[PDB]
């Protein structure tokens, strides 16, 4: 690390490359929560038979007096399945994947399946591009992922049928999971030790700012294709600017090529302008500097002490992500504009990050998790209880509960590293991030329980954070306590 200071700490290279590597995370939110728009559900009712010489004589009504989304009259007034398809409202959404290939009534769930698959890609991409980034390096893999996100995200916009769309969303989410992974690593291994913490919050705030981008881009371009394309097309640019990057000098050392560690540090010293210092640098200096440094997930499940942490922490991450996507993947039904709420959610995350930070230091870490979760679960239970007519009340509670889940994410990311000792911290935090994604796969699969009982997803998304708030009690406090190095510690 001292060397980094020798070649110029937080130098221009640390301004230029760090801006360019964080700029793609402005579209991560867009991609993850895109279907709220590209897969929005316009008011749909069945199409009559052309044989008929309006809708009054051929569509049954429900208790609201609106023409039914699943049936149509067999004779001009028995009801039948709608063989000629459906008529969708060309108002808010001119075309969506729900309108394009009919993901409605019987295929009501196929739209959630896509999100599940996208998120199956996001689970796989943390594993695949984690291993490939240790072998090929951070920069390469990032080059290949900016290419893959752009190609598969453009081929999703030009997919002729839903199965091919689901395959290209899985490839897009896999590349984006390797981007969200290796953007931090490449931005942490090039900046000094006391500024590492500032890189991880910058990344968290730039994701929150990407919601505002999604709301404005989807309002300007509602059609799903011109929307899926416009969110994916900047990744071609990303790709062409990622060549110019410099590969991690830490990766070089560990992997072995200490001799690249020399060039890497010397170029960065030429960009920072302190070339003389790097000039002083040599291989002889590198042998002694990283001498010490240069010189498994089954442990968690072998050590009873470390299991305790693991099984407790695994729920927290799971429950935080599961109820987050359970309350964010349904903009509709809040009684208000689906774009406006996307702006309000992004804007509640912001003070949430602070007020979360204040309670994290003043009352302690452990209290936070339970507080954030418990209130998140209570807010989401109240959404399933309170009637649809109270639009402003369910909007206010959902926005509070979503901000409490953003406050939980920050809290668990800090708290989990303080709970694990140095020998299993990075491994156990990577396994914690693996449980959140599992939570993102299972969340759309619980949205399909709306067909059983309309409020049953909101009851499961509200019960799981309340159950997880009691699991924070089973973990110790870590406010003002020093970072453990061994399993004996604590
Ligand atoms: C995208 C990011 N990827 N890492 C990040 S660290 C920064 C951080 C943020 C934050 O808002 O500050 N988070 C999200 O947006 C949540 N996670 C997800 O939406 C999905 N997820 C889970 N685990 N990783 N992503 C949490 S993960 C911790 S933000």
Q: Which two tokens stand for residue 477?
A: 């406090």
Atom number, ligand 1, closest to the C-alpha of residue 433: 23
By the 8 A CB rule, do 162 and 178 touch? no
**Statement to judge: residues 129 and 225 lie in one domain:** yes
**Statement to judge: residues 291 and 304 lie in one domain:** no
**Residue 409 within a domain:** yes
**Residue 397 within a domain:** yes
**Statement to judge: residues 252 and 310 lie in one domain:** no
Q: Which two tokens stand for residue 59?
A: 């569509």
Residue nearest to atom 9 of ligand 1 (CA): 204
- How many Å separate Cα 139 from the centre of its chain? 21
User: How many CA atoms within 13 Å lie on the side-chain side of 369?
Assistant: 29
We report the CATH number of the domain holding residue 235 as: 1.20.1250.20
* Residue 408, ligand 1, Cβ within 6 A: no
Other beta carbons within 10 Å of 184 = 19
**Statement to judge: residues 315 and 409 lie in one domain:** yes
**Residue 68 within a domain:** no
User: Last residue of a domain, which of 248, 267, 295?
Assistant: 295
- Residue 167's contacts (CB-CB under 8 Å, 6 or more residues apart) are none
**Statement to judge: residues 201 and 233 lie in one domain:** yes
* Residue 325, ligand 1, Cβ within 6 A: no
Q: Which two tokens stand for residue 462?
A: 């509200």
* Residue 409, ligand 1, Cβ within 6 A: yes
Residue nearest to atom 1 of ligand 1 (CA): 180
Q: Name the phi and psi angles at 483, rounded to 5.
A: -60, 120
**Statement to judge: residues 209 and 290 lie in one domain:** yes
> How far is Cα 373 from Cα 303, in angstroms, rounded to an integer?
28
**Statement to judge: residues 242 and 327 lie in one domain:** no
User: Last residue of a domain, which of 295, 318, 341?
Assistant: 295
* Residue 433, ligand 1, Cβ within 6 A: yes
Measured CA to CA in angstroms, residue 38 lies from 94, 116, 148, 447 at distances of 10, 15, 20, 17
* Residue 28, ligand 1, Cβ within 6 A: yes
**Statement to judge: residues 213 and 323 lie in one domain:** no
**Residue 70 within a domain:** no
231: closest CA among 94, 31, 53? 31
**Residue 92 within a domain:** no
Residue 159: which domain range? 1-29+108-295
Q: Which two tokens stand for residue 316?
A: 């927290």
142: closest CA among 264, 247, 16? 247
**Statement to judge: residues 174 and 239 lie in one domain:** yes
> How far is Cα 6 from Cα 39, in angstroms, rounded to an integer?
51
429: closest CA among 305, 293, 316? 316
**Statement to judge: residues 320 and 392 lie in one domain:** yes
**Residue 43 within a domain:** no
Measured CA to CA in angstroms, residue 143 lies from 124, 177, 178, 245, 401 at distances of 18, 13, 10, 9, 37
| Of 409, 412, 435, 443, best ligand 1 pocket probe by most atoms within 8 Å of the beta carbon | 409
* Residue 251, ligand 1, Cβ within 6 A: no
The most distant pair of C-alpha atoms in the chain lies apart, rounded to whole Å, by: 92
**Residue 78 within a domain:** no
Experimental method: cryo-EM
* Ligand 1 center to 409 CA (angstroms): 7
Atom number, ligand 1, closest to the C-alpha of residue 126: 24
Q: Name the phi and psi angles at 487, rounded to 5.
A: -65, -25
User: Last residue of a domain, which of 267, 295, 323?
Assistant: 295
Tell the burial category of 448 from Cβ atoms under 10 Å away from its Cβ (0-12, 13-18, 19+): middle
**Statement to judge: residues 306 and 265 lie in one domain:** no
**Residue 41 within a domain:** no
Atom number, ligand 1, closest to the C-alpha of residue 208: 11
* Ligand 1 center to 321 CA (angstroms): 9
User: How many CA atoms within 13 Å lie on the side-chain side of 100?
Assistant: 20
**Statement to judge: residues 279 and 329 lie in one domain:** no
For the chain, how many structural domains are there in total? 2
């Amino acid at each position: 690390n001292d060397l980094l200071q020798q070649v110029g700490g937080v130098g221009r290279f640390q301004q230029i490359q760090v801006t360019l590597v964080v700029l793609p995370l402005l579209l991560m939110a867009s991609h993850n929560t895109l279907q709220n728009f590209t897969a929005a559900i316009p008011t749909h009712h069945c199409r009559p038979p052309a044989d008929a010489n309006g809708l009054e004589v051929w569509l049954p009504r429900d208790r609201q007096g609106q023409p039914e989304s699943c049936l149509r009259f067999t004779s001009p007034q028995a009801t039948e399945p709608c063989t000629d398809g459906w008529i969708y409202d060309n108002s808010t959404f001119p075309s969506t994947i729900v309108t394009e290939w009919d993901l409605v009534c019987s295929h009501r769930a196929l739209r959630q399946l896509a999100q599940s698959l996208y998120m199956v890609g996001v689970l796989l991409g943390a594993m695949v591009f984690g291993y490939l980034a240790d072998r090929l390096g951070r920069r390469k893999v990032l080059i290949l992922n900016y290419l893959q996100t752009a190609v598969s995200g453009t081929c999703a916009a030009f997919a002729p049928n839903f199965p091919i769309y689901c395959a290209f969303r899985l490839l897009s989410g896999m590349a984006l999971a390797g981007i969200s992974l290796n953007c931090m690593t490449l931005n942490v291994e090039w900046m000094p030790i006391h500024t590492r913490a500032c890189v991880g919050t910058l990344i968290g705030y730039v994701y929150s700012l990407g919601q505002f981008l999604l709301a404005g881009v989807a309002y300007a371009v509602p059609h799903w294709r011109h929307l899926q394309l416009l969110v994916s097309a900047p990744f071609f640019a990303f790709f062409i600017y990622s060549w110019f990057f410099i590969e991690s000098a830490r990766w070089h050392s560990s992997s072995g090529r200490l001799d690249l560690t020399l060039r890497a540090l010397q170029r960065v010293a030429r960009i920072n302008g302190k070339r003389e210092e790097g000039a002083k640098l040599s291989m002889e200096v590198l042998r002694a500097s990283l001498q010490k440094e240069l010189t498994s997930a089954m442990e968690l499940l072998r050590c009873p002490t470390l299991r305790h942490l693991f099984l407790c922490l695994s729920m927290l991450w799971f429950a935080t992500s599961f109820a987050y996507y359970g309350l964010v993947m349904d903009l509709q039904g809040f009684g208000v504009s689906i774009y406006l709420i996307q702006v309000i959610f992004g804007a509640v995350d912001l003070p949430a990050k602070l007020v979360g930070f204040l309670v994290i230091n003043s009352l302690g870490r452990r209290p936070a998790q339970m507080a954030a979760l418990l209130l998140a679960g209570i807010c989401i239970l109240l959404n399933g209880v309170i009637p649809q007519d109270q639009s402003i009340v369910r909007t206010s509670l959902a926005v509070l509960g979503k901000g409490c889940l953003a406050a939980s994410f920050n809290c668990i990311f800090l708290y989990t590293g303080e709970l694990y000792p140095t020998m299993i911290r990075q491994t156990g935090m990577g396994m914690g991030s693996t449980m959140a994604r599992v939570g993102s796969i299972v969340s759309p699969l619980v949205s399909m329980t709306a067909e059983l009982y309309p409020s049953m997803p909101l009851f499961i998304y509200g019960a799981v954070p309340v159950a997880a708030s009691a699991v924070t009690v089973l973990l110790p406090e870590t406010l003002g306590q020093p970072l453990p190095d061994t399993v004996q510690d604590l």
